[PDB]
Symmetry: C3
Subunit: 230 residues, 3 copies
């Protein structure tokens, strides 16, 4: 394939596929209805990402957008991936602390705005406008992280000790992990164009694998996903 | 900007943004889980509309459709906005009367058909076919309003007095408000072409602000959104 | 209309419309909240299919895709139809056996992958890649059917006798019905090109009517949809 970033797309596809298979096997026989929910959510995430990375690898999840007087390749499939995987990851965190339905709707709604406006910015042909959308997208991200930090941390400390501790780790990972995305966008070819596309693709692949496989390995090795029973 | 309707798009963007901020502040500190749901729903609505109005203002939410032997500008972002905000508004009404899950699925499903077929009609290149889709869309709207009037009014009179009264007002507003949309479509440039695009845009902006901010001001000033407690 | 398959599109539109009307009338007056859910789900299915078949009939739900050195007409509206109707049909089956929330999320998620990857394969311009997507789509289908057969059959035998029997019939129909779809795709013009488009359209219309009207007639004539009451 005549795209230098192909190597990072192939590696990402393989790792998401292997992650999906592992979770699928690990989840066999689990009957606790609570654990079944976490396994369903956490296995679906890398299965979706697998299909999206494959679509980028084969060239389908790519388009050309003119801005800055040039044809810029844009992997729109990245955003389709995040559109579906980020709300599932939020659902994992919300179920852990038994968040109320009102707060879940707020987080998922803000997440849709986050990804939707990011996509609009990626496809926008007026260069200066691209960063208006980036700003709105990042504001929605900060609202999410505010809720996860100050909204959820209070509900967790009153819960089981294994629920409060697992959430604390997954929360710190999320804040650091989520916050890198808008930075890579700003410095890569969709934004300021300081880092070339092949390195931009590597950085998003490292982040995506950490979030869609790494995060799941941490959650599914915790005792919190099971109900307290004899 | 070289579009005469730009003024109405700028005004709509500003009003949705101001409405979102107001609701966001008003909702701070609210802890009653019932009120949290209404604030989550009712704040998300104008935040979505804000992004959609901005996308029309900057030119992204617009396309050209040939029919009647002319290039007709179509603001497809209007429909993307309604696709997400009208089911949230229905959820507000359904939660108020504690509607059963079966009736909610019917309303949301009929609402998706309503907006989906309206979009198809807006993008249809055969002029006469456009009104076939308008007719199907309007039939789905009448089903919704039938349920809100005859379906829900019975469940409300048995509920708390502040729930029955709030719903009655929001119901009358909804019937009048919702019914104007297909009329403006039919008379504006998407339909018969009697009213020019700049006035059509003004009329939809007046309606959208009434529905996405106005409606919310009425709901969130009612006692019905809180649980009965000491 | 200058497309020989138009006759099968017109017939499909009519049958979905008639099916929608029948279910709509049959459901009048039903007040049992459990039966209301099944009627809501089962009436929405053919109403969606009606709009999609109409969009194919009028030419809107069609596009041209170059592969094998030819312009191949692709009815993308088929996939939009299935995207919404197949998860509703799964919800019908899941509610019948009172499946847990974890298993429902798994089935609906796998169903979205099934249809999404099928659509990608239909729109893919590299001929050999089309069948890669077909393979992934079919694997997701087999996971669904595995769960319906081995996952759900165990939960049903412990339920009411009228619930276990109704599900058994709807399960056998589903396995045979669902499995024909990937076969028709492979042999028709989207795949190997052995069967011409007009016969391919007939076969999918026969299948769609069986699934979106036939299946519903079986379910809504069963006692299982009502709660056990005096
Ligand atoms: C988890 C255990 C494994 C840890 C692994 C962490 C890797 C994550 C970071 C990678 C960035 C790599 C940056 C590579 C930069 C190459 C770009 C380049 O060639 O820049 C020179 C240019 O030609 C002229 O300026
Ligand atoms: C809430 C408090 C404020 C209430 C505000 C309510 C406004 C809503 C209606 C506006 C329609 C305005 C119609 C303006 C018509 C102008 C079109 C025009 O110029 O038509 C003449 C044409 O050039 C030759 O026929
Ligand atoms: C439910 C009660 C009614 C049951 C009804 C079941 C119909 C389902 C199957 C139809 C396939 C029809 C196949 C028709 C084949 C025609 C194609 C043709 O013309 O092939 C010859 C070709 O020209 C040179 O090989
Ligand atoms: C000029 C201003 C323009 C408008 C601002 C930018 C809009 C997009 C950014 C962020 C989304 C904000 C969050 C949207 C969801 C709010 C939900 C909410 O208020 O939830 C309360 C509930 O009590 C919780 O549990
Ligand atoms: C509880 C549920 C809450 C759900 C909240 C969802 C909020 C989504 C809002 C805005 C993003 C809209 C993004 C739309 C991008 C479409 C781009 C597109 O397809 O454009 C066609 C073509 O490329 C160019 O005309
Ligand atoms: C809490 C998480 C927050 C996450 C969000 C943080 C956003 C701000 C970060 C960096 C912007 C730094 C400025 C980047 C713009 C540089 C523009 C430019 O011209 O760069 C030239 C280049 O440095 C040589 O060629
Ligand atoms: C020729 C006829 C063509 C077909 C007709 C036009 C289809 C589109 C129009 C309206 C949607 C109708 C409503 C769809 C949802 C029905 C849900 C239902 O029946 O709900 C029963 C439940 O008991 C309630 O609580
Ligand atoms: C419980 C959930 C119930 C959900 C019920 C949902 C019903 C939606 C049905 C029909 C509208 C379909 C509209 C599809 C419009 C797509 C147009 C498009 O993108 O066309 C591409 C291009 O512009 C031209 O080929
Ligand atoms: C309950 C809510 C129901 C809401 C839905 C109501 C729909 C019917 C309303 C108006 C149609 C009136 C006819 C409009 C068509 C006029 C066509 C035409 O040629 O108009 C010429 C013009 O008047 C001079 O140039
Ligand atoms: C190389 C391998 C590539 C990756 C494989 C192909 C991916 C797409 C195919 C099938 C989806 C599989 C099902 C996805 C959903 C799994 C849900 C789950 O594990 O559910 C457990 C729960 O306990 C249940 O009740
Ligand atoms: C609990 C919820 C779980 C939800 C699980 C959903 C999984 C969907 C995954 C992959 C399919 C993606 C298909 C995307 C197809 C878009 C094609 C398109 O519009 O392409 C534009 C143009 O035609 C060419 O660039
Ligand atoms: C449980 C449900 C499973 C459902 C999924 C079953 C998939 C496999 C079925 C058939 C493939 C048979 C081979 C088809 C490929 C034929 C290619 C070819 O060249 O055919 C030439 C033609 O026969 C003369 O011209
Ligand atoms: C795949 C898993 C995760 C957690 C992915 C998260 C992605 C983001 C947080 C992306 C955020 C963006 C922002 C905030 C600005 C516009 C561009 C992005 C969509 C990359
Ligand atoms: C933004 C809030 C509301 C309540 C918007 C409602 C929009 C409609 C009811 C639109 C209905 C249409 C019909 C009935 C006919 C096809 C064209 C429309 C989509 C405008
Ligand atoms: C309308 C109701 C049903 C049950 C439709 C089901 C459709 C499928 C099971 C289609 C499956 C496909 C596969 C498995 C392979 C790719 C192509 C298809 C989408 C046709």
């Amino acid at each position: 394939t005549g795209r230098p970033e192909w190597i990072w797309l192939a590696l990402g596809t393989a790792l998401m596929g292997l992650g999906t298979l592992y979770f699928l096997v690990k989840g066999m026989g689990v009957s606790d209805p609570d654990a079944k929910k976490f396994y369903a959510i956490t296995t679906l995430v890398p299965a979706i990402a697998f299909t999206m990375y494959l679509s980028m690898l084969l060239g389908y999840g790519l388009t050309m957008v003119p801005f800055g007087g040039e044809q810029n390749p844009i992997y729109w499939a990245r955003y389709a991936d995040w559109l579906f995987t980020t709300p599932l990851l939020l659902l994992d965190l919300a179920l852990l602390v038994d968040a109320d339905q009102g707060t879940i709707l707020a987080l998922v709604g803000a997440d849709g705005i986050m990804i939707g406006t990011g996509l609009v910015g990626a496809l926008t042909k007026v260069y200066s406008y691209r960063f208006v959308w980036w700003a709105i997208s990042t504001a929605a991200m900060l609202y999410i992280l505010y809720v996860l930090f100050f909204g959820f941390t209070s509900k967790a400390e009153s819960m089981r000790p294994e629920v409060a501790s697992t959430f604390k780790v997954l929360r710190n990972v999320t804040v650091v992990l989520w916050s890198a995305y808008p930075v890579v966008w700003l410095i890569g070819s969709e934004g300021a164009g300081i880092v070339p596309l092949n390195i931009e693709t590597l950085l998003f692949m490292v982040l995506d694998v950490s979030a869609k496989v790494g995060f799941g390995l941490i959650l599914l090795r915790s005792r919190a996903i099971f109900g307290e029973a004899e």
